Amino acid sequence: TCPFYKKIPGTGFTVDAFQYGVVEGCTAYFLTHFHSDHYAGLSKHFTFPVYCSEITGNLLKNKLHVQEQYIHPLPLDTECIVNGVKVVLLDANHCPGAVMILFYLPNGTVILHTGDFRADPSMERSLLADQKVHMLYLDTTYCSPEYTFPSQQEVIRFAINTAFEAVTLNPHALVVCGTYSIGKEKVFLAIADVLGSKVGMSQEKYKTLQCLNIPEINSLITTDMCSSLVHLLPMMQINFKGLQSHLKKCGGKYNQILAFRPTGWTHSNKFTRIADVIPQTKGNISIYGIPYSEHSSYLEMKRFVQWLKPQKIIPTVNVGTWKSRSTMEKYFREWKLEAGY
Numbered sequence: 001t002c003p004f005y006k007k008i009p010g011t012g013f014t015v016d017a018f019q020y021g022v023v024e025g026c027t028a029y030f031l032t033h034f035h036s037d038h039y040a041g042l043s044k045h046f047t048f049p050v051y052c053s054e055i056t057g058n059l060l061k062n063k064l065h066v067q068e069q070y071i072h073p074l075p076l077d078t079e080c081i082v083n084g085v086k087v088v089l090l091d092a093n094h095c096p097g098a099v100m101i102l103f104y105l106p107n108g109t110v111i112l113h114t115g116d117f118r119a120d121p122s123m124e125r126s127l128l129a130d131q132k133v134h135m136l137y138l139d140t141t142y143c144s145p146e147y148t149f150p151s152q153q154e155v156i157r158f159a160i161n162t163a164f165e166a167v168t169l170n171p172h173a174l175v176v177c178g179t180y181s182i183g184k185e186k187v188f189l190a191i192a193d194v195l196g197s198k199v200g201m202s203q204e205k206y207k208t209l210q211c212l213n214i215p216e217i218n219s220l221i222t223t224d225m226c227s228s229l230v231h232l233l234p235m236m237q238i239n240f241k242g243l244q245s246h247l248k249k250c251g252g253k254y255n256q257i258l259a260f261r262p263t264g265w266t267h268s269n270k271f272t273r274i275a276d277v278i279p280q281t282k283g284n285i286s287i288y289g290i291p292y293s294e295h296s297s298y299l300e301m302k303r304f305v306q307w308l309k310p311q312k313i314i315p316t317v318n319v320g321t322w323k324s325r326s327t328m329e330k331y332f333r334e335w336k337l338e339a340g341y
């Protein structure tokens, strides 16, 4: 059944709750972003109002064939009325089209649902600064102090420098990047830019990227693999067998592959700096795991919450085990006692 952390009290609303059938009492289904664990259940047969960003609504229409009459896109950073309730969509610094949702309940309670987010100090100057938030529905993916990672900028600098050096040493090397969802487009676009190439990909992935409102995108991507020296493949194909196989397909145009796997966190992060990352190599194939995250680190999450000073926190991630729930509640209390709210 629909869990309580997906329901907004005092409303008829749910968030990211499309896989439970008709939720009793739901008059509007909000969708924070287009990732499968969140949209699970939507299709062309859905006949309830879906509220989301413009970009998410482009993907619902083009990839899932949801009918236009049920898609309700909202502009960001704008006070809107939905079934008699004031709401605002804010940028979540996650994947393209991802939002946080502010609900202003008729009784005067204010609720923030972060969806999936990477907390940033820039959020402290959005419409969030203007009033008090009483309850926080929080993306707790990486809510433990072991989870450190570098900035997105540091990671992209490493990837660009690595790729440019490799291809300049060997003009016959191919660069491959893995993907299994939207998000993390900066990895493959920054590398293609430094090399003066478009990124080549499947027709299905090209279609997905053309929904994202990225500026000048027609200049950066292509379905012609032959004209491209940065290829995108499914994340599943980023291993020695899959890459050897792909190289055969390129017909002796290339004699070396340098491949990137943008993981979330990996336990090389506790010890190893970004400067010191090394690849796994077999023969003429090398694979780099890079820690490019679109979720908050522990310290980023803690800074946002200590800034916001919510009265009550409701985790939306890692809620399935008692040990995880108890650990998270301990951190929340630490943060509250340290900051004095």
Ligand code: NI
Pocket: 033, 035, 094, 116
């Ligand atoms: Ni997500």
